[PDB]
């Protein structure tokens, strides 16, 4: 049961760890941060199944 | 003193009331399936 | 393993008493019993039951069948073909590859 | 579980269960006790023992109360039903309970409290009968496992006096003593009680008793209430001849226990004893 | 590895009986190892030699049983030529047991065993035929 | 220990637990399980028995071992993909891994035999609370990698875990190792249908958590233990052995009670995506577990094992502390079939 | 209706707060008049089914059945409220709801209609029946017969249920009347036939075949008889009564598979009435006497011919009564000598006459002769067998000579002849007995008057 | 005794009945408007 | 006909740590 | 009563069941393809969001 | 997992705002009553088993049993229904959004179609 009450409620406590880009201190640039936001931008609305 | 005796009965009375909770029922959900009331064969123009 | 004896037998009604009809201990309550289950038992479901269903309407629709089949008769009679279609259906009425 | 408000008592005393031994001079024992100490004197608690607590207070008829009645075993020892053993290990149950009954009295008003006879006393009884035979051995393997599955939980013993008289002396006014039964017990056999009883009880106990935490306590306090729990194990199946009962009698003799007044429901809610109605609304 | 079971698949039909064989006797061997394998995990067999003894029980006795079902179930195939129909590997199935019921030197075990090993692998054909799924994917 | 400590532990189980239901990135989901494994230990330490200690041992060192090859299995998803967050994993060498772990977390066969032995070890609170509040994390979790599960894998631990949930149900006498085994063979049936639609998994895991609260309240009422322990107690408060009967039932899934629920939705889910055989053999299996939950009925409620006379004192008196949330836990767990479409609820 | 079913559920309340010496005669004077309010029922129509709620329908090959289920609630009642009366009065009250709990099952699974609510009460009627066999049945065996009459019911109904899902995924809905209308064929291949069984089995368990039989015998042998009489006169009967429902579907397989059932079947009939022939003890011989009739049935439900089914509903009514009738006549000689064994009881007609009257009317009609509806329900499906195959006749004709002397020889064993000296225990007759068996027999032949409203839908 | 509890508790499940109606009431008036 | 209610055999069947 | 009562009553019954089943029939469809691609509202999974993605000048003069 | 995860709505709130258009069930909806039931004998076997004059003593409590089940099943049955109307309505539109695998199949009679007879012997 992905009870996700850290998004409903917003405190985001888990979310930032996550992911290569993200807002990192300094803005340090991860190594692979350009191929990594491109095929996020192209993961959304497109969901899990199709997006594979 | 005779109240006791009703007390004795008191049981009888339940089913019947069955019985006719029974008969509304029926009447309501066959209510719930008129549905129809004009079919192809069996219907005259109402009087 | 200590127990009680043992039952002492089957209990005559009758060893009580004369007339128990069966039923309960209680010499009172038989008759009321015996009363109620024949009553019942017999005269109003073995005969107004019973009479009930011989009366029943015709849904059957049987009488009615068998009218309307006369119904039927005549005119195959008067018209005098064929009486026995061998069709159920009319032939023209289905299309065949 | 509402220790947390209060963190347990910080109050310390003791109960006092007199050991004396004997038949006219155990009713002897007990007048010493009862007068010595403040707190309640042990009654004996023998058969009707739990019916004296249980509501009506009162004692019922022996047999479902206990269905085993010392002078039926005084009058045939070695009777071929084993009321011999079943008298025994009942009273044990018993005397446990008087524990209870006390122990936890202990543990609340931290008054002192006079135990008549105690389980550690129970012992010896068995540990003749074992000798003179009216027991068969098994009764006794089943007597020291529920002995050591129940008693070593109980922790804390003692604060007690351990007494003595002389058997022929007891036997002296066991005479002057009425009761029929009584007289006729045998002598060997309460020679061959003391014998072990001086042997082996006091030898063991006075050495706990010498030296006579608080957390402890309160989770031995739970234990205290809740008596069906002290009583958890005495109901072992273990399936001797003699305790056993078959299930036509005891579904009989239960079918009969509820028909008293007091016992149909749980004592607060009963209607046949003139429990208030006003609960039940 | 499915690789395995892939090689025994492509029979094809039952020619050259052989080749069918050899791979139901791999199958077999495989299975005998890995029922060693567990019964030795979990049965301490005590003096290792005893263990391989064990072991080359097992084995050869699988090994034996997948041997003899493939050959007779081609065989079959090849003689009533029928060949098709589920009945072909019944037989097989039906003496494999007997050969079970040899190394266990008991009539017992060897009759049940032909008759459900027979159903089995009945089963087994009547499926291929069908396409029955077993571990359907998700699907729904 | 005093229960202002005991209440701290349990409640850090539960945030334990609560932690792998919130979080999303995996780092928080095995420090969930990690978390809950310290809190878990000691509460079964309580009493402390020469058996408990080696009961806990046995726990904690399969629950470790467990947590260790998730860890790695996670660690080698994120050389293969470099994310954290749960959603499908990229890598099947790793995948099987996760879902062994996780096979050992559910106690699921051949992983399982850990089970039926530490239930022996402690008390039936600990016990119930170790067969109920255990099984949600890592099932929290499955629910979640449903998508990518290699279903042939999850399907022969899912069978496999009723097989061994039956056969070794018939042959112990005393009941903790039992419900271990009733446990051990739904775990089957949870994990069975979770390839392919899991909101019928969490419906049955309701409806299991249910029946063993039933149960494991029940024992507790009566302190029964070994069948024979159980068998006498027909005399003394005959309801809850005449109570223990129907939720018994309710395990066996004689239909017109609540545990057919369960069977007839997954019986419905795997149809619809063919895979006709496999519940066939799953259903049939499920008879040889109702067996065993029969003949443990025919020790106590419905045959009358000779009673020892020394109930008799025992009689006389009420048992207390009484557990308010029981009668409940009975009724939903048995009565409530005509309330099925109500599982949409769970969307 | 839902007008019957709901007083049927009101008499449990009724139960529980009657008073503790008189519940006997509550529930047994409102099941009567229960019953008589389930007659009007019998109307049906002679077209259409007849209809009600979304939920229920009751064609008619239901309603006779529905009456008689309805029927047997007083009967059980006046057989069992003798043998019970030292038992504690919650224990009692608790008793009759088993009862009528089960009557509310089967009042529920006759009228069906969708198909899984059908099956799922068709299973749930296995509850009180066995919490009846085990712990009112005498005897040790008893334990041990709970598991037979147990397992082989599920192990032949839940591969039904899960095809039961399957059909209402490959086509639309699950409901009786679309898939009489909907029907279409299946055939051969592979995966068909194991359709097929797994529809069958079940039901051709529940009611016994040959092969499978053996927990029934074991069954009665063992249950008080209030359970008896259920178990023989209506649970088989019902499992019959789905099977000839769900041959609405299958065609034409049926004419490829019925041969191996039928051959169980032909067979085993006059197999299981020889064994029939040589019992030890009575309360068994009556259970293979109806398993010896129940494969009558069941070939005539699998040749398919309506004539088959006609007979098939009328030997289902007929063998239900007769069969509990023996029941109950032969549970009063136990009680008056506890022999059980038949040899014990020897000149039982010396020593009290009216008795050895029922046990002639009821033996006369298992031996089914004219116009019993025994009889006329067994002729028609013996024409239709014969129609099916010329040489069936030999067969039959067989069972027509063993079902006449065992049912002879019960008679004239355990009566003609003379009275053993010692057994004092008889004590002639009560009127509860009389009473009882009078009610079985007299519907059973005033029903002969008029067959044609029991002769159900293919009439 | 009449004690506290009973009116308590009695009292909470009165409230919970005319807090249902109540919501209900309200709710069904809210399906008119978005409705009819 | 009392019943049959189990016995001290049958009952130690089960008495056993595994039956 | 008239068959009539009967007549409408059966043809309501056998109107609404036959609608259930088409319905059923039809949402097995609706399941089977939407599952099959994705495109439907109501199997897709979740999947990473834009916002985490930070947008600013790193460092590094390229990523 | 379906449904959950579709567009738009938010995780932990028990009913959405886009329900309540839907009409509440009635007072006296048979399934809602026999909540109350179930809530009913719960209330019963509360006291059987804490022995208790069963029925007439706690009737209090037993009240309050029934009040609670039937409070909670009102909601649940809201929630019930206002999924199913959800999965219909997203049935609808995505037939809508595939007309062309959603084939409008031409409606031959029976008349035009031959179908293959099977005598009973
Ligand atoms: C579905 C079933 C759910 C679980 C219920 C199991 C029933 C257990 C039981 O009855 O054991 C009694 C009984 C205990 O023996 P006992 O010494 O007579 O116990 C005293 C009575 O329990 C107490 O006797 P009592 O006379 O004091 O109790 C009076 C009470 C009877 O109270 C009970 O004993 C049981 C309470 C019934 C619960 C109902 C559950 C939901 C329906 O009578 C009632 O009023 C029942 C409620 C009916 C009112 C409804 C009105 C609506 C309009 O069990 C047995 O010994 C034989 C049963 C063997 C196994 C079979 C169990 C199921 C059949
Ligand atoms: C005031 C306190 C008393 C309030 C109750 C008054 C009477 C209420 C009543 O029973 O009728 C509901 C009544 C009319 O019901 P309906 O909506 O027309 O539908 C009834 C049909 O049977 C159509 O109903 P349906 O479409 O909901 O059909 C029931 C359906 C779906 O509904 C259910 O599942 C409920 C059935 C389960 C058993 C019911 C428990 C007993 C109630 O369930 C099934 O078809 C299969 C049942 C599953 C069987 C499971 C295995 C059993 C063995 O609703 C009302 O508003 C009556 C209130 C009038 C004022 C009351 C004041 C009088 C004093
Ligand atoms: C110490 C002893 C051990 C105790 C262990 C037992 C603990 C039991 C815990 C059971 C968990 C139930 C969940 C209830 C939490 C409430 C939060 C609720 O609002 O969740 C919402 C969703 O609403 C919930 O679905 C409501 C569930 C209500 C529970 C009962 C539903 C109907 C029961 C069906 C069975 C029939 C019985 C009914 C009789 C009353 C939001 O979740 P959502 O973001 O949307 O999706 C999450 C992903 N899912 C669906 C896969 C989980
Ligand atoms: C592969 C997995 C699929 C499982 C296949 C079928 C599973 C159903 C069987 C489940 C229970 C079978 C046995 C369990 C209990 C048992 O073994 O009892 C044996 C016991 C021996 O005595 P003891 O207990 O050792 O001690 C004596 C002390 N006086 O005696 C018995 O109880 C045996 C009789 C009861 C079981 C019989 C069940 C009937 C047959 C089972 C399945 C039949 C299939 C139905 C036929 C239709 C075909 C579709
Ligand atoms: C050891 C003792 C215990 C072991 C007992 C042994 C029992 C053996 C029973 C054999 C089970 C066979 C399982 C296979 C069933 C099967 O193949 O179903 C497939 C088939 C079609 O699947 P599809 O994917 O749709 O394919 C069609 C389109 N391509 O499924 C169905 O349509 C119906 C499903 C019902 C399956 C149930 C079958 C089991 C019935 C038991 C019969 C017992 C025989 C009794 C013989 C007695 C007669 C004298």
């Known amino acids: ?52 | 003193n005779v109240l006791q005796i009703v007390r004795d009965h008191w049981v009888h009375i339940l089913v019947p009331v069955g019985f006719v909770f029974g008969c509304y029922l029926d009447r309501r959900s066959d209510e719930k399936l008129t549905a129809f009331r004009n079919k192809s064969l069996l219907f005259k123009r109402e009087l | ?97 | 579980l509402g220790e947390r408000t209060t963190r347990k008592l910080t109050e310390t005393s003791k109960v006092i269960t007199v050991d004396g031994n004997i038949c006219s001079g155990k009713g002897r024992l007990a007048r010493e006790i009862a007068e010595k100490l403040g707190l309640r004197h042990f009654p004996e608690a023998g058969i009707h023992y739990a019916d004296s607590t249980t509501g009506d207070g009162k004692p019922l008829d022996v047999q479902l109360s206990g269905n085993c009645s010392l002078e039926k075993f005084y009058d045939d020892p070695k009777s071929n039903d084993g009321n011999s053993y079943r008298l025994q290990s009942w009273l044990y149950a018993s005397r446990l309970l008087q524990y209870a009954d006390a122990l936890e009295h202990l543990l609340s008003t931290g008054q002192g409290v006079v135990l008549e006879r105690s389980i550690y006393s129970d012992f010896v009884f068995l540990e003749a009968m074992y000798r003179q035979g009216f027991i068969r051995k098994q009764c006794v393997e089943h007597y020291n496992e529920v002995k050591k599955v129940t008693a070593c939980e109980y922790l804390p013993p003692h604060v007690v006096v351990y007494v003595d008289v002389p058997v022929p002396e007891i036997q002296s006014r066991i005479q002057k003593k009425g009761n029929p039964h009584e007289m006729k017990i045998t002598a060997a056999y309460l020679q061959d009680i003391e014998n072990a009883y001086k042997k082996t009880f006091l030898p063991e106990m006075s050495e706990k008793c010498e030296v006579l935490d608080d957390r402890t306590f309160h989770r031995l306090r739970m234990l205290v209430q809740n008596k069906l729990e002290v009583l958890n194990y005495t109901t072992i199946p273990v399936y001797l001849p003699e305790i056993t009962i078959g299930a036509h009698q005891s579904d009989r003799v239960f079918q009969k226990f509820t028909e008293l007044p007091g016992r149909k429901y749980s004592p607060g809610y009963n209607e046949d004893v003139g429990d208030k109605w006003i609960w039940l609304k | ?140 | ?347 | 209706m839902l007008k019957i079913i709901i007083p049927t559920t009101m008499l449990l309340p009724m139960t529980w707060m009657s008073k503790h010496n008189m519940i006997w005669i509550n529930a047994t004077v409102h099941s009567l008049l229960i019953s008589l309010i389930s007659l009007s029922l019998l109307n049906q129509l002679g077209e259409n089914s007849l209809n009600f709620s979304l939920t229920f329908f009751s064609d008619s090959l239901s309603a006779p059945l529905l009456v008689l289920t309805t029927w047997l609630l007083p009967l059980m009642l006046m057989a069992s409220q003798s043998h019970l009366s030292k038992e504690t009065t919650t224990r009692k009250k608790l008793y009759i709801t088993m009862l009528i709990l089960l009557q509310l099952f089967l009042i529920m699974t006759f009228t069906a209609t969708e198909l899984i609510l059908f099956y799922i009460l068709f299973e749930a009627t296995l509850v009180p029946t066995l919490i009846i066999i085990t712990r009112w049945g005498n005897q040790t065996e008893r334990l041990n017969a709970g598991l037979y009459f147990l397992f082989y019911t599920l192990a032949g109904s839940l591969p039904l249920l899960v095809a039961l899902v399957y059909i209402q995924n490959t086509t639309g809905s699950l409901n009786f009347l679309i898939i009489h209308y909907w029907s279409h064929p299946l055939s051969n291949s592979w995966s068909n036939i194991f359709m097929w069984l797994a529809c069958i089995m079940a039901f051709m368990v529940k009611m016994p075949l040959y092969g499978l039989h053996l927990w029934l015998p074991k069954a009665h042998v063992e249950a008080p008889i209030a359970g008896s009489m259920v178990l023989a006169a209506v649970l088989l009967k019902l499992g019959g009564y789905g099977m000839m429902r769900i041959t609405t579907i299958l065609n034409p397989l049926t004419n490829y598979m019925a041969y191996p059932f039928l051959m169980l079947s032909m067979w085993g009939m006059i197999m299981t009435s020889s064994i029939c022939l040589r019992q030890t003890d009575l309360k068994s011989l009556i259970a293979y006497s109806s398993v010896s009739h129940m494969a009558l049935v069941i070939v005539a439900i699998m040749i398919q011919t309506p004539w088959s089914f006609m007979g098939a509903t009328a030997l289902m009514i007929a063998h239900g009564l007769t069969s509990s009738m023996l029941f109950c006549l032969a549970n009063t000689n136990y009680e008056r000598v506890h022999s059980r064994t038949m040899i014990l009881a020897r000149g039982l007609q010396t020593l009290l006459p009216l008795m050895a009257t029922w046990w002639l009317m009821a033996s006369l009609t298992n031996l089914a002769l004219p116009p019993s509806i025994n009889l006329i329900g067994e002729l028609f499906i013996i024409t239709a067998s014969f129609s099916w195959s010329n040489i069936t006749i030999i067969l039959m004709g067989m069972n027509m000579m063993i079902t006449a002397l065992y049912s002879l020889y019960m008679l004239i064993t355990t009566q003609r002849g003379k009275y053993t000296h010692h057994i004092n225990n008889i004590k002639a007759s009560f009127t509860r007995e009389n009473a009882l068996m009078a009610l079985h027999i007299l519907p059973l032949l005033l029903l002969t008057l008029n067959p044609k409203m029991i002769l159900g839908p293919l009439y | 005794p009449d004690w506290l509890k009973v009116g308590l508790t009695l009292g909470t499940s009165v409230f919970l009945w005319i807090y249902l109606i109540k919501q209900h009431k309200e709710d069904v008036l809210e399906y008119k408007r978005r409705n009819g | ?19 | 009563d008239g068959p009539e009562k009967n007549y409408e009553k059966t043809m309501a019954i056998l109107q609404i069941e036959a609608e259930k089943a088409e319905l059923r029939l039809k949402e097995l469809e609706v399941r089977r393809l939407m599952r099959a691609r994705g495109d439907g509202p109501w199997y897709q999974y979740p999947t990473i969001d834009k916002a985490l993605i930070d947008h600013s000048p790193k460092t590094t003069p390229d990523n | ?121």
Request: aromatic letters at 10%; charged letters at 15%.
């Open chain 3, 1 to 97: 393993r200590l127990q009680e004896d043992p039952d002492p037998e089957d209990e005559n009604l009758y060893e009580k008493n004369p007339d128990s009809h069966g039923y309960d201990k209680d010499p009172i309550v038989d008759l009321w019993n015996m009363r109620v289950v024949f009553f019942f038992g017999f005269s109003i479901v073995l005969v107004l039951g019973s009479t009930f269903v011989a009366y029943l309407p015709d849904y059957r629709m049987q009488e009615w069948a068998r009218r309307e089949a006369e119904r039927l008769v005549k005119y195959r009679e008067a018209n005098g073909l064929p009486l026995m279609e061998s069709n159920c259906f009319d032939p023209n009425k289905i299309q065949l590859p």
């Open chain 1, 1 to 52: 049961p992905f009870f996700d009450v850290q998004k409903r409620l917003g405190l985001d406590l888990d979310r930032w760890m996550t992911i290569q880009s993200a807002e990192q201190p300094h803005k340090i640039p991860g190594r692979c941060h350009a191929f990594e936001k491109e095929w996020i931008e192209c993961a959304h609305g497109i969901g899990g199944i199709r997006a594979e």
């Open chain 6, 1 to 347: 220990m005093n229960p202002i400590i005991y209440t701290t532990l349990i409640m850090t189980v539960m945030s334990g637990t609560m932690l792998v239901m919130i979080s999303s990135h995996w780092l928080l989901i095995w420090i969930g399980f990690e978390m809950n494994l310290l809190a878990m230990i000691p509460v079964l330490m309580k009493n402390f028995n020469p058996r408990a200690t080696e009961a806990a041992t046995k726990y904690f060192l399969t629950q470790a071992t467990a947590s260790m090859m998730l860890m790695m299995a996670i660690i080698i998803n994120l050389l293969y993909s470099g994310q954290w967050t749960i959603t499908k994993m990229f890598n099947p060498v790793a995948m099987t891994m996760m879902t062994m772990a996780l096979a050992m977390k559910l106690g699921l066969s051949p992983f399982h035999f850990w089970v039926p032995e530490v239930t022996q070890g402690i008390s039936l609170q600990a016990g119930l609370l170790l067969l109920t509040w255990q099984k949600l994390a890592p099932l929290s979790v499955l629910c979640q990698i449903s998508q990518s599960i290699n279903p042939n894998l999850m399907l022969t631990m899912a069978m496999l875990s009723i097989l061994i949930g039956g056969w070794g149900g018939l042959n112990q006498t005393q009941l903790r190792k039992i419900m271990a085994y009733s446990s051990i063979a739904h775990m089957g049936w949870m994990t069975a249908v979770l390839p392919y639609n899991t909101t019928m998994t969490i419906l049955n895991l309701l409806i299991y958590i249910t029946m063993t609260l039933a149960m494991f309240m029940l024992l507790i009422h009566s302190s029964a233990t070994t069948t024979l322990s159980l068998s006498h107690t027909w005399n003394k408060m005959p309801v809850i052995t005449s109570l223990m009967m129907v939720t018994l039932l309710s395990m066996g899934g004689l239909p017109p009670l609540s545990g057919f629920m369960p069977k007839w939705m997954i019986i419905q889910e795997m149809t619809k995506n063919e895979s006709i055989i496999m519940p066939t053999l799953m259903a049939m299996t499920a008879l040889l577990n109702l067996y065993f939950y029969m003949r443990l009925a025919y020790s106590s409620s419905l045959t009358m094992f000779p009673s020892t006379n020394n109930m008799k004192m025992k009689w006389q008196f009420e048992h207390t502390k009484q557990m308010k949330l029981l009668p409940t836990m009975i009724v939903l767990s048995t009565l409530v079939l005509p309330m099925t479409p109500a599982l949409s609820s769970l969307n």
């Open chain 9, 1 to 19: 006909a009392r019943q049959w209610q189990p016995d001290v055999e049958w009952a130690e069947q089960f008495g056993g740590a595994v039956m």
């Open chain 5, 1 to 140: 590895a499915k690789t395995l079971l892939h090689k025994y698949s492509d029979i094809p039909e039952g020619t050259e009986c052989h080749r069918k064989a050899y791979a139901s006797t791999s199958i077999g061997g495989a299975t005998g190892l890995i029922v060693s394998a567990y019964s030795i995990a979990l049965k301490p067999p005590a003096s290792f030699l005893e263990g391989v003894a064990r072991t080359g029980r097992y084995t050869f006795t699988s090994a034996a049983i997948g041997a003899i079902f493939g050959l007779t179930s081609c065989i079959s195939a090849q003689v009533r030529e029928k060949p098709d129909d589920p009945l072909n590997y019944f037989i097989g199935g039906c003496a494999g047991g007997l050969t079970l019921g040899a190394r266990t030197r008991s009539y017992g075990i060897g009759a049940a065993a032909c008759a459900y090993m027979g159903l089995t692998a009945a089963l087994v054909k009547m499926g291929q035929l069908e396409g029955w799924q077993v571990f359907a994917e998700p699907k729904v």
């Open chain 11, 1 to 121: 997992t379906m449904m959950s995860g579709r567009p738009g709505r938010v995780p932990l709130q028990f009913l959405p705002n886009e329900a309540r258009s839907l009409p509440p069930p009635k007072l006296t909806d048979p399934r809602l009553v026999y909540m109350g039931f179930l809530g009913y004998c719960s209330g019963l076997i509360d006291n059987a088993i804490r022995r208790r004059p069963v029925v007439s003593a706690g009737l209090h409590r037993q009240l309050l049993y029934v009040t609670s089940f039937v409070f909670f099943g009102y909601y649940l049955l809201k929630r019930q229904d206002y999924m199913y109307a959800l999965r219909d309505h997203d049935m609808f539109a995505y037939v809508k959004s595939h007309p062309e695998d959603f084939p409008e199949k031409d409606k031959k009679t029976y008349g035009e179609i031959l179908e293959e007879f099977h005598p009973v012997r």
